Assembly symmetry: D3
Homo-oligomer: 154 residues x 6
């Protein structure tokens, strides 16, 4: 709907280890989405447990958290029209076995537990994840020189 919608995109430790930061950022940049926050971070366990709160009563929660502590994460906020849903489509199916070539996971990933990246699955979950991973001051307000060539309206 509105061009100022925001989503949380994270490059997971395997994506960082495998040297996929540049290519993944380029996918969103090239689409016309606007990077409004980014940091390389190794978040505390409590923050990862909150991010994965929906999985805390599911099997093998401890192992997920330990894996996500095992390397740096490139955390990002991207902004644009339908960026939540379109970002998920750019990432590709969450399990790379089901993803399409031309998406991030369809180009770079094989195992669902090593699926390179995360994207918010809804507008409301995006707002929650952005608040969890970023201080408000870390969200940078700016206007792209090509805004009116990417968008026909606000």
């Amino acid at each position: 709907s509105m061009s100022n919608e925001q989503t949380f995109i994270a490059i997971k430790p395997d994506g960082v280890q495998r040297g996929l930061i540049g290519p993944i950022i380029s996918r969103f940049e090239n689409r016309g989405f606007k990077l409004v926050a980014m940091k390389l971070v190794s978040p505390p366990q409590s923050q990862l447990e909150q991010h994965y709160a929906d999985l805390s009563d599911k099997p093998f929660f401890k192992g997920l958290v330990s894996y996500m502590l095992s390397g740096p994460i490139c955390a990002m906020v991207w902004e644009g029209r339908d960026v939540v849903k379109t970002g998920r489509t750019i990432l590709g199916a969450t399990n790379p076995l089901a993803s399409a070539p031309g998406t991030i996971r369809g180009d770079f990933a094989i195992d669902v537990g090593r699926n390179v990246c995360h994207g918010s699955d809804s507008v409301e979950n995006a707002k929650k994840e952005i608040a969890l991973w970023f201080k408000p001051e870390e969200l940078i307000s700016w206007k792209s020189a090509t805004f009116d060539w990417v968008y026909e309206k606000a």
Copy 2:
């Protein structure tokens, strides 16, 4: 059967030109095996754009669509190859980028349907009409690709 000398009209719209997508879009068609037979950077007159979009003349956003298509240069192209009309449309991706797939031009580069960076003919007969509208017949260059027999098994 489909013949390898089918032609389609592909245009890079002003937003495509402004956002520096000329090279990447041409590469998509080149790499697939299609043959560039005509190309020109053009700022066509309003009357030609209104003819191109005559199917939409009675819509209210017509005046604004034509105004946007006048707002910058256009890279007009004719591409030739087997099923190039249909496959060209697939390469561009869904007309509305919201519905397009990553790996297509719009799925890689575009967001808004009104800023969908390119155009492709939607049928062989519409391609013929668009080619006659945007090009003089002498602007179509006859030539044979050195790899024709490696792209095509017949025709």
Copy 3:
């Protein structure tokens, strides 16, 4: 999609070699996380190609298919990884490029089904047969990728 040591046979056909697509095709499998365990440029004899296409021996186009595959070099490969047979075919795209999706090898590079740039084994059992036909066993190279544990969940 079971064991991470599944193997498939991928060949770049004469038209793929002629059109300079060796690099790009290898990069697609490399970038996905699959492991190259065998490779050679080869112009195999007619009898090998007839054996490769043995399941088509009673089709009328058999002789013409064999003759075309003799018309230039072939880059023969074995790739290894989880679900590499089926995912490999997905990466190649639909056998007929007219039905293939942009983002796949054929959806990016090919038009005619008889000039579809590449081949990949269609089943695990056919992959084992094709690997045994195109490579000597000592041509399969045993090695472990430095990023194995970032591509695959332990």
Copy 4:
């Protein structure tokens, strides 16, 4: 050095035949130069003889004219600060064997007689070549949305 300097860049028939139109355009696009005219053409022999009139006594002249007639040419006018000199640097040394990897000829070409592209060698020669290859109404006046991010001033 004004930012409205213009140069003539042509992709020669070998560049067209070998599928290098896209990549060569991207090199100039990516650098920040502005495409102001472009057409695919098969110019008459007279125009090519005028284009290479200074070499009309050189031995490779008539063979050059014949090869320049042997396929389409992608003729272009590019605009920007020091675009004549920097454009030649982007093309690389006239003889590709003396050119640097990272230039067009250093990435794509081998023989000086098959060196993929032409670029004007001086501001005055650019003006002459633009007048020879283009009608003035084929040069398109426009303003790049990122002009103020490519240039500090005009």
Copy 5:
């Protein structure tokens, strides 16, 4: 010439507002990633003028000082720290000559930039100025400690 020999050398690389505006974050990061260098800190930031004036303290006697600061205020900056052998000097070589007119195709500025006042990126010019810039642009806890899985394939020695 002389090159560094310590694999834990660090440099500060910034993508300037024009590089962010022109969509070059991904390509520039890929250049350093592809070379084998390790990203140890990164953030998108619009720093205050006081920090930019400190960043350019070595140029505070130059006539272009004020304009340089004002320009760096004009949009977001992708600030980064990269780690690896000779990363200060090799990082500058990857960026290319500071003035893009003098830069070579195949470098960042040789591929992407024209005007020195819009030269897309910055790299520390010395080991000591890298130390200063790293500490100026990043809080100490924003430097991330990790070990690249391919370290022993990028480097032959410690």
Copy 6:
């Protein structure tokens, strides 16, 4: 000086670090895009005796045993490329042997840092290419074919 024979051949190897770091495709593409013709290729883990022969000129050096041990530590993508001046131009494409001295735009200037992890090898002379080609490949593994675009890459035979 540059070679003038279009059937010159050189030996290019992607070293174990090039293979490990996923550079086979990009490296092949550099030579493919330049117009050179691939006439032989195989993934190989050669025996120590062959690597010792390949580095015969360094058998006296103190790092010889370690250099051999490292070249044994992973697979190698061995190739023969054919074209005009392919030996010298091939080395230029690879970049300076020490990546620290190489230029961005070359293979080592894009991908490598340490001279002992410089991702690839190219023959340093026409004669050493002939020797390396014969050392790394059986004669029947060199493939005879004619590129569809030969006459567009080359102005003369």
